[PDB]
């Protein structure tokens, strides 16, 4: 059952029947929703032409994990920036039809004489449904003008709008971007929406400062709502709320007679109260308890911090405060280290976004989407580096990640089929970018081999003492080790490393075996 | 672990000490130095339990060592100054002496290096793990199961296992070459006995005074025809 | 004086100058036979550039009497020196810092094992957590070996007390297959079944498999000799 | 210094910065307050009463020591900060630089982490001990 065939079938059926009730229970709608649910969202290919410092490039992206490795001046963050531009258009069309996205501004084009325009090409694959988008911009004063092609994106976003129009519990894809400025964001220095909708997340793509404050407000509201569930309040509370809403409506009617801001505020409060009443009706129809979501978030954060016992909200000084118990000491959020603050903000933001975007799923941590992370190993000691990847791909298994790293320890825990190495090779006097793969499998090997193969760098420093050891080794292997010069070199080595060092012991073993080989040959000659 | 050949007693000032006086902390530095003189002689330069090097060939007091009693002081108080209860242990805060006293256990199921040969129970591996030999009865199997648990000599990863693996892999070149020569000799045609004898005595000469000497010995003899 | 100090810190460059072009102006750095715009530098080189520039700026102003102001006295504290640095850069930052300013006292904290391999063992302190008399308190120790010039994993294991080999699930079959081999049970059907998974994940030519085959041949020859 | 997360690596550096702040303030002018210890920085244990920091500065053979302390709620405190040793050194530098010009002064700098007349013609600011990296734009404009 191709997605397009069910889409056109529902489109042609919509025109005939005018009644919405029949459409809501139509068989075609059920088929479209069913085939939409298992359609995994994932990007396929990307290409760059004359964008910033990049001349040309073609990159194929895996569906589960991709890692970029290599140092150079063009900057790997540029590649992530290109992807951020493309996904912005997809989000805009979902919000409203034909809404403009993000254009390529003038100065990002290359400054070379023989350039005229810059282009970005991308492709999105959903099972057997393929779409492509091209975004381009030409220099000022060019003879020919270029325009973007938005047919595929508009068609893809129309399906989501159609499904979301008839069903109020539709799930939407997730897009996020974590730049390197989150280090300041997660500082949490000492600097109230009654209802939350899934459209709030679509306001911005890049992680920002206001997200932490929204996280605090959302946590407070969720805990307060779970308090009513704990109290097991009966339906009389709904009756009291209805009475208050009726009184507010009467006040609004009195206000309409013989204060525009007051009227707007009263109308907004009435709408919020009506939404709360509809939430109470859904409570009668039953739903996932706020307690289950509360401990789902708490346990999710606690999975990445094994050194903490519990996290709680304490009401004091007419305000709320987060208390974490480590060992036998209670601590505040501001007293944590930089690494724990970074992990706390990253996981909290991801959990909030996924929970808000899937109100209908029993386990909201299984939604689809794409997440781009830059410098995954910020403020992390080597012990945490070897387990961050496994925990990330185990808590959220249905999300595609794109990551750039700089540490061999992280690189030693990923498969060799997800590693792309970027190298600049000067050919014919012109530097060219190429992409290669590791020679051998690097998952499970020591971090020294991962540095030797995955990064192509010598894992041994070039200090002066290394030259002494190498020179002594050459003499030993060359069998004229018995000389005054070797004795002088050896005295230096013993003085620096010491006689008990394993490296010196290896050379001693090499001497001893060579001495024994002629002895045994002479014995049985 | 390795079997310890205790020499003639050398308690010295220990004999002058009295049980009724007690006051283990009252021992002066001179007595501690005298004790260490004999202890280093009997124990070599290796820890009794983990066999990590404890004394380095002569700026800082590296590898801090503390004198440990085999039995608990509280309930075997009569052996506070007993000569046979003296042992030397490293300063690692996660194993050996500093880890023995933090648990509750039966005192009759512990292996003593000066009484029974540890080679009967344990069998080391190239990767650095410890494997209990099969065919033992119930009481010996329980004894070997508990001594490793109390001494933390069999961790899941890291700890002493990583160090043992690194030490084993550093010395594998000598073992491979020695068995390479052995093969030749044998094939060519020479009195097996002779070959054996030599390949052993020489290896024992070249392995004396080294870190984790039993793990290397076990690996070598496993691959030595 | 500032420009020469930066040139001394990075000898790979020839000269640095500011050029006012026909319409623009920019700073040009020459290395070998190639001229590069200052903005083309990566984040790590920019961080090094501003760190050395600030240090030189303070030293010049504080010592107006000395002929060579780079011989002043003071103390400098640096936190997380290895931030935003490629591994090839981390292996030479300490020597250059300790050679450009030879009369300054440095206090540095770091996370990367690559930096540790270039530091002498007499200047290393390790912080641990131990409990004495029911109270948990911090403690400071020293490395037991010489870590200058050793490989990367040796420095990680001795100077940081961490396992250099990961505990991945794919590793789980490796030690089991090794253990079965060492017990002279390599011909068992379980070993044959496990070898399919290992050889599929790693491959025939991987060095780890090669050493396992060498051990197989050695044990087989020993068994052949013993049987006869 | 090598360690894991939450092991006080940044605590030591902040302690030294606290110690050096008072000496810098005394050098600039006699009897000038330095940097105090924040209330939240005190240990949260039940039996703690005050927090103290001690330091020793050795100049060839001359020696000096400075102690700074603050008590949160303990009834008994360790009197006040002992600044007698650092005032002699500050007066020494003031004396030497008062008579003979173009003198020399010690250098104190602290490159922290993200967190967050008098040769002022050049625009370099010596007042702030703390300095932050990844500010290449400002240094480019200064150059
Ligand atoms: N008031 C307090 N009482 C007790 N412990 C505290 C208090 N405030 C902070 N801590 C401890 O401080 C530790 C972190 O200290 P610190 O910031 O020095 O760590 P770090 O990892 O060395 O830092 P950085 O990443 O900045 O170098 C936490 O583990 C916490 O237990
Ligand atoms: Zn030990």
TrEMBL record, chain A:
<feature type="binding site">
    <location>
        <position position="111"/>
    </location>
    <ligand>
        <name>ATP 1</name>
    </ligand>
</feature>
<dbReference type="InterPro" id="IPR041685">
    <property type="entry name" value="AAA_GajA/Old/RecF-like"/>
</dbReference>
<feature type="binding site">
    <location>
        <position position="111"/>
    </location>
    <ligand>
        <name>ATP 4</name>
    </ligand>
</feature>
<feature type="binding site">
    <location>
        <position position="111"/>
    </location>
    <ligand>
        <name>ATP 3</name>
    </ligand>
</feature>
<feature type="binding site">
    <location>
        <position position="76"/>
    </location>
    <ligand>
        <name>ATP 4</name>
    </ligand>
</feature>
<protein>
    <submittedName>
        <fullName>AAA family ATPase</fullName>
    </submittedName>
</protein>
<feature type="binding site">
    <location>
        <position position="326"/>
    </location>
    <ligand>
        <name>ATP 1</name>
    </ligand>
</feature>
<feature type="binding site">
    <location>
        <position position="107"/>
    </location>
    <ligand>
        <name>ATP 3</name>
    </ligand>
</feature>
<feature type="binding site">
    <location>
        <position position="78"/>
    </location>
    <ligand>
        <name>ATP 3</name>
    </ligand>
</feature>
<feature type="binding site">
    <location>
        <position position="73"/>
    </location>
    <ligand>
        <name>ATP 4</name>
    </ligand>
</feature>
<feature type="binding site">
    <location>
        <position position="76"/>
    </location>
    <ligand>
        <name>ATP 1</name>
    </ligand>
</feature>
<feature type="binding site">
    <location>
        <position position="76"/>
    </location>
    <ligand>
        <name>ATP 2</name>
    </ligand>
</feature>
<feature type="binding site">
    <location>
        <position position="109"/>
    </location>
    <ligand>
        <name>ATP 2</name>
    </ligand>
</feature>
<feature type="binding site">
    <location>
        <position position="109"/>
    </location>
    <ligand>
        <name>ATP 4</name>
    </ligand>
</feature>
<feature type="binding site">
    <location>
        <position position="77"/>
    </location>
    <ligand>
        <name>ATP 1</name>
    </ligand>
</feature>
<dbReference type="GO" id="GO:0006302">
    <property type="term" value="P:double-strand break repair"/>
</dbReference>
<feature type="domain" description="Endonuclease GajA/Old nuclease/RecF-like AAA">
    <location>
        <begin position="43"/>
        <end position="410"/>
    </location>
</feature>
<keyword id="KW-0067">ATP-binding</keyword>
<feature type="binding site">
    <location>
        <position position="77"/>
    </location>
    <ligand>
        <name>ATP 3</name>
    </ligand>
</feature>
<feature type="binding site">
    <location>
        <position position="73"/>
    </location>
    <ligand>
        <name>ATP 3</name>
    </ligand>
</feature>
<feature type="binding site">
    <location>
        <position position="75"/>
    </location>
    <ligand>
        <name>ATP 1</name>
    </ligand>
</feature>
<feature type="binding site">
    <location>
        <position position="78"/>
    </location>
    <ligand>
        <name>ATP 4</name>
    </ligand>
</feature>
TrEMBL record, chain B:
<feature type="binding site">
    <location>
        <position position="50"/>
    </location>
    <ligand>
        <name>Zn(2+)</name>
    </ligand>
</feature>
<keyword id="KW-0862">Zinc</keyword>
<dbReference type="InterPro" id="IPR013467">
    <property type="entry name" value="HNH78-like"/>
</dbReference>
<feature type="binding site">
    <location>
        <position position="47"/>
    </location>
    <ligand>
        <name>Zn(2+)</name>
    </ligand>
</feature>
<dbReference type="InterPro" id="IPR053575">
    <property type="entry name" value="Retron_Ec78_HNH_endo"/>
</dbReference>
<keyword id="KW-0479">Metal-binding</keyword>
<protein>
    <submittedName>
        <fullName>TIGR02646 family protein</fullName>
    </submittedName>
</protein>
<feature type="binding site">
    <location>
        <position position="96"/>
    </location>
    <ligand>
        <name>Zn(2+)</name>
    </ligand>
</feature>
<feature type="binding site">
    <location>
        <position position="90"/>
    </location>
    <ligand>
        <name>Zn(2+)</name>
    </ligand>
</feature>
